[PDB]
Structure formats: C-alpha cells, structure tokens
C-alpha cells in the first residue's frame, strides 16, 4: 500500500513529472456573519478552464529544522507530496500540497495532511494553515473535509500581479 | 528642516533609541458590504494600554536590490524610519514605519510614506501594502489619510501566538 515519508536527497532525481493542474469550474463567494465573525461562502459556477497550481526548489526542504517535504509513494513511484514550513505565528504552513491528477479523490491528500499534522505536533506547533484562491473550489472542499475553517480573506493582494481579474485569497486554519 | 534619506552602514551606531510604543484605546470592528466587496469598519473603545510595535536587523536592509530603509533626520538626530521590501505580488511592503513618540502628528510619517512611494515606483512596483492589527487605530487612521484602503483581514492568524485574545490582522493597500 501507499507510503508517506520524508523526502531524501537521493529522491531528487527519481522525482517524476507530477501533474498539479486542476480544472477551475466555480468560485467561492465570501460573506461575513455577525455571529462569531464566521466567514461563510456560497459557490458560483464560472466558465471552466485548466490551470497549474505552480519558485519551489525541493532541495531547500531537505535537512532543515523548520521546513520539510513528505512524499507519497505508490507502486515505486512518487504520486504526491506536501511542502511545509513553520510560520511566524507558530503554525505549520502548507506551501503546496499536490496529488498527481490521475490519483486524486482516492485519499492520498488526506494521508499527506495527517502526516503534516504529526510534523506540526512534533515541533510544538499549535495548528496548520494555508492560503488558496477562491477559484480552487476542489482544494477548498478538501480542506473543509480535513477540518480546516476559513479565518480570513483578501480581495486586493492578487491585484499586484493582475488588475483585470478578481481573484480572492482565502486563509484556512486547523487548530489542534 | 527634516531630511529623509536611505540608511547607510555608517548610521548603524548613530542610531538612537526610538520610542515605537503607542497607546491602544480602541479597536476596529470589521464588516463586509455587498457593494464592491468593500470592507468597512466602526471604531469601538477598549480599556487603554501601551504596547510596543516591535526580529528587525537594520543591516539586512543595506545594499539590497529589493529592500531598503529610509530614515527621517531632524536636528542631527534620527527621529523615524520606514522599512520596505518587495513582496511576492510585486507591491512594496512596509515591514515597519515608526516615528519617535515625541514627534508624532507633525507630518513625519507622511513624508516617510511619500519616499516609500518613490522607491516603489522606481522599482516598477504597482503599489504599497502593509499589515497592521485592528487595535492600532492610530496607524489605521494614518494609512487611511495616506490613501490606503482595506483589502483583507484575518481573524485567526494571531491565535497561533495567543488563543485568549481576539486580535485581527488588517491588510491595507495603496495602488498607483
Ligand atoms: C496550499 C495549497 O497547496 S493550495 C493548492 C492545493 N493543491 C492543488 O490544488 C493541486 C491540485 N489538487 C490536488 O492535488 C488534490 O486535489 C488535493 C491535493 C487538493 C487533494 O488531494 P486528494 O488526494 O484528491 O484528496 P482526498 O482524496 O484525500 O480527499 C479527502 C476529502 O476531500 C474531498 N475532496 C477531494 N477533492 C475534492 C473535490 N474536487 N471536490 C469535493 N471534495 C473533494 C474528498 O471527497 C474527501 O472527502 P471524504 O474524506 O469525506 O471522503
Ligand atoms: C506596518 C506597520 O508598521 S504597522 C505599525 C505602524 N507603526 C506604529 O504604530 C508605531 C507607532 N506609531 C507611529 O510611529 C506613528 O503614529 C505613525 C508612523 C503611525 C504615523 O506617523 P506620524 O508622523 O504621527 O503621522 P503624520 O503626522 O504624518 O500623520 C499623517 C496623517 O495621519 C493622521 N494621523 C496620524 N496619527 C493619527 C492618530 N493617532 N489618529 C488619527 N489620525 C492620525 C494625521 O492627522 C495626518 O492627517 P492629515 O494629513 O489629514 O493632517
Ligand atoms: K489555489
Ligand atoms: K499594529
């Protein structure tokens, strides 16, 4: 069965092309309730398109006290990975989680998250967090299934790259 | 009169103790309108207390392509400074702006912001941004007077440091 383990220098050249692309078919619409500052959302369909999530240099995460990469291995091949760092607020921060396109929805991502939680706890980190865009509904639903909640959002940060679009950053948190 | 110029190595030992403390006397209460995703706020008084804004190592900002420190000089003394970097979204990012307590409300901060805008433009940066806490109403009003608008907020990021309090991060933006 599937194995999740820490990335090693010797894995760097055996690292295959992993398809991190996904289909954007909808977007989250955010709202702020007056009850417990709860950020809520509704889903709105948008004309579909494909995009790649992704600079990430794997070697920068090998042999480091506060950052690490875990890889998912199935039938002698790396089929997914998770990139983690310790953030300024003490939480573990997911820089990137990717499962090869052909193997998604089969529980690999949840197993990567479970390992990330172990790493966070081993380092005395009180939770895990990450940022995603409101047009990555697949990822949003995945984090929600994993126990994460929306703690914040930002309507202007993406304008610095492109002023035409209306991409929104969403910040997700899982507290232990 | 006042002089604003780039920090030099030779200024490092002539750098005096600058009082960056401020009095917290209120906090911003955020809301999200349905019109143009406008984030609004109201001010609520809170029992007052003093806190220091501030690791920042000035030497890390000397002789760098994408980061810099400008100092404010008055009567042979450094009375304020602004710390800037280029962010991932291309905006100039204010890591810290401080005017010595005794000289506040006399226009020094606005002059530091003006210089930061020049630096941003010289580097082809499309705007300037920063993060502050909802309990720093003085800073919030100052940014608002300087033309900044609220682009986002986060209710959980501060929980990683302290779970008892309810500090909220506010992200401000000035687009050119
Ligand atoms: C910080 C960041 O990295 S943000 C970017 C995240 N990465 C990407 O978007 C790259 C492309 N996407 C992917 O690689 C994958 O879709 C991942 C990593 C997000 C998820 O990995 P997967 O292995 O597919 O997730 P997994 O099968 O473990 O799903 C776990 C749960 O989430 C749910 N889920 C997963 N994908 C979806 C989806 N597209 N829509 C709805 N629910 C979903 C599953 O149904 C499952 O729920 P359950 O526990 O109730 O059965
Ligand atoms: C990213 C970060 O650094 S967030 C932390 C910001 N830094 C701090 O909080 C450190 C402590 N505070 C300070 O150092 C100063 O208060 C600063 C840097 C925020 C502002 O510097 P100052 O030199 O006092 O500001 P300056 O006098 O230029 O004020 C410019 C405008 O803002 C307004 N303003 C300044 N302080 C306040 C205040 N406390 N309340 C209301 N309005 C204010 C001024 O009235 C002025 O408005 P005008 O142009 O309409 O006359
Ligand atoms: K995303
Ligand atoms: K602040």
Automatic annotation (TrEMBL), chains A, B:
Regions that span the bilayer: none
Residues engaged in binding acetyl-CoA: 97, 99, 105, 107, 109-110, 136
Tree of life domain: Bacteria
InterPro entries hit by this protein: Acyl_CoA_acyltransferase, GNAT_dom, MshD_Acetyltransferase, Streptothricin_AcTrfase
Signal sequence range: none
One Pfam family in the UniProt entry: Acetyltransf_1
All residue ranges annotated as the N-acetyltransferase domain in the record: 33-176
Protein name: Streptothricin acetyltransferase
Source species of the chain: Bacillus anthracis
């Amino acid at each position: 069965s599937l194995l999740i383990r820490e990335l090693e220098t010797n894995d760097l050249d055996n690292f295959p092309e992993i398809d991190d692309s996904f289909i954007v078919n909808a977007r989250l619409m955010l709202s702020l309730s007056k009850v417990n500052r709860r950020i809520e959302y509704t889903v709105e369909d948008v004309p579909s398109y494909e995009k790649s999530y992704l600079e990430l240099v794997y070697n920068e995460y090998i042999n480091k006290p506060n950052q690490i990469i875990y890889i998912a291995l199935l039938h002698n091949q790396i089929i997914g990975f998770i990139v983690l760092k310790k953030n300024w607020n003490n939480y573990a921060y997911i820089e990137d989680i990717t499962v090869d396109k052909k193997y998604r929805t089969l529980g690999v991502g949840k197993r990567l998250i479970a390992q990330a939680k172990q790493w966070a706890k081993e380092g005395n980190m009180p939770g895990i967090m990450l940022e995603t865009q409101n047009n990555n509904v697949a990822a949003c639903k995945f984090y929600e299934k994993c126990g994460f909640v929306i703690g914040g959002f930002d309507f202007l940060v993406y304008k610095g790259l492109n002023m035409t679009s209306d991409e929104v950053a969403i910040y997700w948190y899982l507290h232990f």
